[PDB]
Paper text:
pmcCK2 is a ubiquitous and constitutively active protein kinase. It has a heterotetrameric quaternary structure, consisting of two catalytic subunits (α or α′) and two regulatory subunits (β).2 The α/α′ subunits carry out the phosphorylation of target proteins and peptide substrates, whereas the β subunits confer stability to the enzyme, control substrate specificity, and govern cellular localisation of the holoenzyme complex. CK2 acts as an anti-apoptotic protein and is seen to be overexpressed in a wide variety of cancerous tumours. One such alternative method is via the inhibition of the protein–protein interaction (PPI) between the α and β subunits of CK2; the PPI interface is not as well conserved among other kinases as the ATP active site hence its inhibition is considered a more selective approach.
Numbering used by the authors:
A (entry chain D): 205 to 212
B (entry chain A): 0 to 329
Amino acid sequence: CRLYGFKW
Amino acid sequence: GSSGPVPSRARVYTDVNTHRPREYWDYESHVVEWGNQDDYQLVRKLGRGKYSEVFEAINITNNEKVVVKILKPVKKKKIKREIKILENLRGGPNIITLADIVKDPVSRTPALVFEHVNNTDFKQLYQTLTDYDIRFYMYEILKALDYCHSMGIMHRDVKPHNVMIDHEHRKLRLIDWGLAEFYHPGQEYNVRVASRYFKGPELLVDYQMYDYSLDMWSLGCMLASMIFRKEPFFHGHDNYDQLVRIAKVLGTEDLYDYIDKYNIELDPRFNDILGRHSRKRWERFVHSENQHLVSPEALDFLDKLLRYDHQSRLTAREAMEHPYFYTVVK
Ligand SMILES: Nc1ncnc2c1ncn2[C@@H]1O[C@H](COP(=O)(O)OP(=O)(O)O)[C@@H](O)[C@H]1O
Ligand SMILES: [Mg+2]
Ligand SMILES: [Mg+2]
């Protein structure tokens, strides 16, 4: 799970 | 020529950027050395705006809690300006610490990594503050503003959401330097800055040759909202109504005197909404629920911040010398 490249 | 607005210079820290090396203020020349985006994993959402989404994150290299400011698309130029200002001001009193700069390899979305502050939403915190607590935190904001002004930087977005307070620790950090700019004497700036309720009269009457004193109008708006428990204090429905809301309290005599001093052309759509207003006494806002926050020293300080004439306002250091702060243990 990822947002703008960052892992949760 | 005869139709120009009259020029203005900051009363203080006027030439500080002139005498710096060019690389200090020339943010367009700044080069970013990107960190490793994989260092940071998002834990929780903290805030979202037209310009950013902000998360609590973990630095997996050291198990440190950080904040990641994911920047919405804007000119590269504006990203370098926020970074350069944060690097210039890093380590100063009550200035948020920039820790790292990273980018999504896929989307190319850049992100600022900051020191985490354990904030309490102003809409919960401010109504709990004692008279002492308000003076204490106002003094902490002034340390940041005198610092950034002394460093040739105007914040241009002073407001509660840009002031992080870890109340457990009485720790304050001035954040959000994305609209901040370098003060150069004679430079004409964009008036579309700050947030409506905190915009100084210079921005509302479209006077471009403004300076650090803009931040002191914003700070006055914060102080008024706080001591009178009325948030926001000047609640305009638009930039034009904003000046009417101000003029209904400070009166129009000093406003027209301001407009005349600087030969400001009043947008003629003010012609039908402004009129003439009496100057009200700061005492009309005092009531049973806020009287414990109000003192002659508080009203005197507020009166010296909320002046139409940017040159007449207290500077951050002059504010620090005001009797309102004599009781703050330093
Ligand atoms: N270091 C931080 N610690 C805690 N919360 C933060 C921090 N930085 C930003 N925030 C939160 O995220 C919001 C948006 O960050 P900010 O830098 O003000 O972005 P913008 O320029 O989009 O307004 C802030 O109003 C605050 O609620
Ligand atoms: Mg902000
Ligand atoms: Mg901002």
